[PDB]
Amino acid sequence: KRLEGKVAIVTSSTRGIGRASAEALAKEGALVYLAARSEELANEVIADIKKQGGVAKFVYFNAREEETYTSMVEKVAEAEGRIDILVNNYGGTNVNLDKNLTAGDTDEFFRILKDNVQSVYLPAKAAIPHMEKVGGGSIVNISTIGSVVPDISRIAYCVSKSAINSLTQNIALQYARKNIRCNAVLPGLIGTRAALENMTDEFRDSFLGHVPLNRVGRPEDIANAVLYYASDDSGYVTGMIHEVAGGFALGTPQYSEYCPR
Amino acid sequence: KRLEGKVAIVTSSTRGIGRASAEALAKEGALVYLAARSEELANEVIADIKKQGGVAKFVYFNAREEETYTSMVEKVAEAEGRIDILVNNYGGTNVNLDKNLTAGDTDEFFRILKDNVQSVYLPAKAAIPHMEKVGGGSIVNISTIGSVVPDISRIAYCVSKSAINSLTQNIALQYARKNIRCNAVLPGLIGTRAALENMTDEFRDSFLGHVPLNRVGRPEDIANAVLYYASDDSGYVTGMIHEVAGGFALGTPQYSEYCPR
Amino acid sequence: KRLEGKVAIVTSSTRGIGRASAEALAKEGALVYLAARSEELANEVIADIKKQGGVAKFVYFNAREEETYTSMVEKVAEAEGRIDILVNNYGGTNVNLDKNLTAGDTDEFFRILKDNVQSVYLPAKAAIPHMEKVGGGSIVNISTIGSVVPDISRIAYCVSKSAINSLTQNIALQYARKNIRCNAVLPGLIGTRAALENMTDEFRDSFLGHVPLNRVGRPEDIANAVLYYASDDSGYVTGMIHEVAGGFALGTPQYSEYCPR
Amino acid sequence: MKRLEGKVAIVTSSTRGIGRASAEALAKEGALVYLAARSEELANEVIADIKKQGGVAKFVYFNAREEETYTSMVEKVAEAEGRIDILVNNYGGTNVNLDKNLTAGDTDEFFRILKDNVQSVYLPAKAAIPHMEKVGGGSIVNISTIGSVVPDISRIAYCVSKSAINSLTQNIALQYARKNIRCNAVLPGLIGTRAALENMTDEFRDSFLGHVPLNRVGRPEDIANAVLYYASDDSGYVTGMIHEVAGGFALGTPQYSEYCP
Ligand SMILES: NC(=O)c1ccc[n+]([C@@H]2O[C@H](COP(=O)([O-])OP(=O)(O)OC[C@H]3O[C@@H](n4cnc5c(N)ncnc54)[C@H](OP(=O)(O)O)[C@@H]3O)[C@@H](O)[C@H]2O)c1
Ligand SMILES: NC(=O)c1ccc[n+]([C@@H]2O[C@H](COP(=O)([O-])OP(=O)(O)OC[C@H]3O[C@@H](n4cnc5c(N)ncnc54)[C@H](OP(=O)(O)O)[C@@H]3O)[C@@H](O)[C@H]2O)c1
Ligand SMILES: NC(=O)c1ccc[n+]([C@@H]2O[C@H](COP(=O)([O-])OP(=O)(O)OC[C@H]3O[C@@H](n4cnc5c(N)ncnc54)[C@H](OP(=O)(O)O)[C@@H]3O)[C@@H](O)[C@H]2O)c1
Ligand SMILES: NC(=O)c1ccc[n+]([C@@H]2O[C@H](COP(=O)([O-])OP(=O)(O)OC[C@H]3O[C@@H](n4cnc5c(N)ncnc54)[C@H](OP(=O)(O)O)[C@@H]3O)[C@@H](O)[C@H]2O)c1
Ligand SMILES: C[C@H](CCC(=O)NCCS(=O)(=O)O)[C@H]1CC[C@H]2[C@@H]3[C@H](O)C[C@@H]4C[C@H](O)CC[C@]4(C)[C@H]3CC[C@]12C
Ligand SMILES: C[C@H](CCC(=O)NCCS(=O)(=O)O)[C@H]1CC[C@H]2[C@@H]3[C@H](O)C[C@@H]4C[C@H](O)CC[C@]4(C)[C@H]3CC[C@]12C
Ligand SMILES: C[C@H](CCC(=O)NCCS(=O)(=O)O)[C@H]1CC[C@H]2[C@@H]3[C@H](O)C[C@@H]4C[C@H](O)CC[C@]4(C)[C@H]3CC[C@]12C
Ligand SMILES: C[C@H](CCC(=O)NCCS(=O)(=O)O)[C@H]1CC[C@H]2[C@@H]3[C@H](O)C[C@@H]4C[C@H](O)CC[C@]4(C)[C@H]3CC[C@]12C
């Protein structure tokens, strides 16, 4: 199996994209750390992964306590003696306050900007020395299709994720000599709790209509890209901006009227 | 496994990237047609794929006989009743005549332009209806990193492969409703006959100095991307321009100077 | 007068963008050759330009007679002793035969591909040695927003214009040392004969709904960019892909729905 | 009649370099230019010089370290002149001692730089927009850097933050197009100003120059000329552009300096 003997860390992995990513890595033989705030929920995912024949473990991560970005990484390295894979999946925004430039909350914009960007910067920074020691690694950053598709709202989300794509590419260039790769996966609309709970039915219905492949995404879709980038199957690939959004915003905005679902 | 029950076609697949891609697909259970100009050589590859537990077959294709792009597709569709996957791998240039704008041959430029672009247009056009009939398909076009990195020579190669990238995305948009996906894989310097026999040691040594991940690629690196795009593992991904070039041209041209290999 | 003493050639310049580009360059003191197929119409424009206080001349050009791309450049250099500016404005498609991949006419796809691409390659190739001689020049290629926005019809147009974008950037890299710059201007919907007579009222109204700046473009909008790139105001600018389409396809395809006109 | 007769512009950090050159170009075309600057003494010298060149400029206090001045400087201009038409956001920088790669760079300073640079667009754009809406439109021109689209091996906070400004530019562009407010980014390469000359070594600057195809160091006027285009109605149908002014730096293959010394 592809990741036999490798150690991976996935943040925010007790549900949705994070959990699917952890499951996919564990199926291919990685020892997967669920870096998550809830040990009780993590233990359920772990038992489920073990049932499928894989090994996963828990390490505490809370985005509200930024120190845990580094401590999570150091705990894993101490316990396993190596770190091979890091998947940075934490991210979000405040739909109540993250609007357009003028209507959005100024302070919250900069809170969101730092919160998302640091969720890549801090753990990547801590993990790199351990990855260097074992002769390489892969860092996979979950961005969003909004990072390359300017919008009319959620400006802090869009800009901060675009910043993550940039940071991905700079990290990739800076540690290529150490065989450390860095790539970004940009999901579109995926049928997780986050989208279903924060975006109204009419928003998601409108959005779906502009998705050429004509369905809502699954967490597995994202996980499968994460697996590609995590493994040596993408060993010659670094700095990629990888779109997993059913072709959303690929072409003309006339698409939905001329190709109606 | 991931491609059990599927029928694939790979053009120019008796060696190098084409062969490796055919091998990777067959290993995952696809029935792979080697669309190639030499039946004798195809029979060798077929015998080896069979040794490995896979099934491959031969269909006649020569880029010099443009009719064969369509006939090979019709032959496969008739023989197997379906086509699921098309990998368009044929491509190239004339190093004697394809130079910069002014020094390169005018007529050859346009010959190359049509030669490369039709190698995607013609077989994709014939394949589509067969793909529609089985509820979808995947078309993977082998471009080159040169398609997004302007150069000081091989202008026809660069321009024609850029055209392919555009063609890839238009096809992707146009057949997404039929669950037909189209993605491009752009190799950098790969250790095949084409690069090793047409480019000098000194050119390839220079090129390698600017490759962040600091090695020549393998046909397997490309085949691994083809596999991703050919399978349902990339079912929500279409219109991608996928760079497999070791990070070549990702960032500053000062790179080799400050990070000397 | 920014262009005093300079010699410019604008193809297909008896109406629309070509004309407006010729007029703008002439107003800034350039001697402007109308490379056109109708001498009679060209003489009307020259007259109008003369009344405005500028100088323009005629040189025969017809895209159906490809030798004229070269002959018209040599005539101009012979008559004036120099060439400074080249605006490649010719281009188009056949709306009856240029559809999607499968419904479009195969042979006409490759005719349009050559026709459009050669409308840049041939005259630029001819002009470069003359620009070299006077210590530099500017080549401005008229592309289209369609070159960076995949569509569901006019596939030959989209791909061929994308090819021109790549050709532009390769030329730019290749002749920078000679101070010969090359940039591309990409118009959106412009109120000229070509759009009004070839596209339906329904199509053009739909398109306009997706233009954030909420008006149809004018030939003058494109001429103004052409002037920028033609002069030393852009002396440190080469290889640009310059969008003049009122924001069309800048951002989310939900735009029209939430921000309707 | 001058192009910007009766318009009011604001240029931040405009007592020298790019900012001064931009102010000068706008004033030369008839705009009333406010120098939003930290030193009234120096601003008065620039004002006197602009006056001699035949233009009109004024002072308004702005210091990046006093973030409330982003807003008060805007309000002051609107109160004094009853309108705002043009905003040029030119303040930006980094700390070369602390802004290194991911691992060697200072964590806290990375996020300080990120907020400093991004807020230098966010805050004053947000304050100016309502005034621009009131006069029927406006143009916001953000001074980025070529580094925003060219990943590097140092100055990661500078690269990432400026990339974020590009994204912010495009979201602003989309969001206020319906108010005829345009937003575009100009990306300077190596310009002969105090900041590049004092903070970068001769060795770095010389190496950089070897990779500039147009083969000279840029001038402040080159940036100013682009600013003038975007600020004026000559670009009235242009919004969301990322405009490169770097003599072709990083346009193409990193082998360029080798083969085109
Ligand atoms: N829903 C979508 O359409 C979608 C699609 C693609 C990507 N994304 C992005 O991908 C990522 C995954 O989101 P998702 O869609 O999969 O949503 P999800 O199903 O609700 O999962 C959210 C995960 O994030 C964890 N989390 C939330 N706050 C946390 C905090 N302070 N500290 C540590 N962990 C925290 C949650 O832990 P608990 O289980 O304890 O709550 C949970 O595991 C996000 O970055 C998002 O930007 C969203
Ligand atoms: N090597 C690289 O660095 C690299 C990088 C990027 C992209 N690519 C692209 O990958 C593709 C394959 O290149 P490669 O490196 O794998 O070269 P390769 O190992 O030399 O293989 C070339 C293949 O193309 C076949 N071929 C040549 N002319 C043909 C014709 N008229 N009709 C049918 N088949 C023909 C050959 O058939 P025979 O066996 O009978 O000779 C052979 O199978 C090309 O599109 C190339 O542009 C290569
Ligand atoms: N309409 C649009 O929305 C639009 C907008 C921007 C760019 N474009 C592109 O910009 C360019 C000009 O388009 P336009 O809109 O300005 O069209 P236009 O106003 O209709 O004028 C088209 C020009 O092309 C000339 N022409 C047609 N066939 C020719 C041939 N065989 N040989 C020489 N000249 C020929 C015409 O000459 P005659 O006067 O003799 O007929 C005319 O001068 C094209 O490259 C087009 O792709 C179109
Ligand atoms: N390659 C290059 O040449 C280059 C160099 C630097 C920056 N840039 C980029 O272009 C822009 C301008 O730089 P430049 O080249 O023109 O450098 P410059 O000649 O050194 O000018 C920098 C300007 O910024 C002002 N400034 C510095 N800190 C300030 C603060 N806290 N508050 C208000 N104003 C402040 C300075 O005011 P004082 O006059 O009072 O000192 C000065 O006018 C920046 O956004 C940067 O991204 C390019
Ligand atoms: C609002 C969601 C984040 C939720 C979040 O921050 N978590 C809660 C934590 S907190 O209570 O706010 O602190 C985000 C995560 C994924 C986002 C979506 C995806 O990125 C894909 C889509 C991208 C588009 O640009 C916008 C719609 C689109 C469909 C996004 C809408 C908002 C989503 C659903
Ligand atoms: C010259 C080669 C094609 C050979 C060919 O077409 N043979 C038959 C034509 S003929 O017998 O000479 O007529 C091509 C195949 C792949 C090309 C390379 C790859 O695409 C990757 C690299 C891309 C860069 O832009 C240029 C260098 C780079 C390394 C390319 C140089 C030329 C190569 C090696
Ligand atoms: C159909 C037009 C070509 C006409 C032409 O070449 N005529 C002579 C040839 S023929 O007689 O018909 O053979 C072209 C020229 C400019 C094109 C438009 C512009 O490029 C801008 C737009 C580009 C988009 O991708 C599609 C719509 C969009 C609005 C285009 C539709 C078709 C246009 C209007
Ligand atoms: C270091 C410079 C800013 C200085 C500054 O902020 N000073 C005050 C801060 S502190 O006192 O040092 O903390 C910046 C301004 C412009 C930058 C340059 C330009 O953006 C253009 C170039 C962009 C490339 O990515 C890197 C080199 C390149 C040539 C840059 C080097 C660093 C420069 C010169």
Side-chain angles (χ1 to χ4, degrees), chain D residues 118-185:
Chain D
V118 172
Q119 81 182 0
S120 81
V121 171
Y122 182 95
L123 296 170
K126 183 165 180 159
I129 274 171
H131 299 287
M132 288 179 177
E133 285 190 5
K134 185 174 276 281
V135 284
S139 178
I140 300 165
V141 188
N142 300 320
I143 315 300
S144 183
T145 176
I146 203 53
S148 72
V149 301
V150 187
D152 217 311
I153 54 158
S154 198
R155 300 166 301 275
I156 192 167
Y158 187 64
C159 288
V160 173
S161 70
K162 288 285 199 178
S163 182
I165 282 168
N166 290 1
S167 170
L168 181 55
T169 296
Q170 294 192 321
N171 282 265
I172 290 172
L174 189 66
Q175 283 164 21
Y176 297 92
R178 284 318 198 201
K179 308 301 185 196
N180 201 26
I181 296 174
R182 304 178 298 107
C183 194
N184 295 277

Side-chain angles (χ1 to χ4, degrees), chain B residues 90-96 108 111 143-147 149 151 153-154 157-158 161 187-190 192-196 198-199 203-204 207 248, chain D residues 255:
Chain B
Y90 174 83
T93 186
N94 187 326
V95 291
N96 185 42
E108 193 70 352
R111 190 197 56 84
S143 183
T144 167
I145 196 69
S147 68
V149 183
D151 218 309
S153 198
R154 301 164 301 277
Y157 189 65
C158 288
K161 289 280 197 175
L189 174 61
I190 309 302
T192 75
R193 175 177 76 177
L196 291 164
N198 292 286
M199 309 310 284
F203 176 95
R204 285 182 278 96
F207 191 100
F248 179 81
Chain D
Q255 287 183 304

Side-chain angles (χ1 to χ4, degrees), chain A residues 137-139 179-183 229-231 234-238, chain B residues 213:
Chain A
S138 181
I139 301 167
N179 198 41
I180 299 175
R181 294 175 306 103
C182 195
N183 296 283
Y229 282 110
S231 73
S234 67
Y236 206 48
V237 183
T238 197
Chain B
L213 284 166

Side-chain angles (χ1 to χ4, degrees), chain D residues 211-222:
Chain D
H211 301 289
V212 182
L214 284 173
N215 201 16
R216 63 164 179 96
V217 177
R219 302 188 257 278
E221 293 84 358
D222 293 324

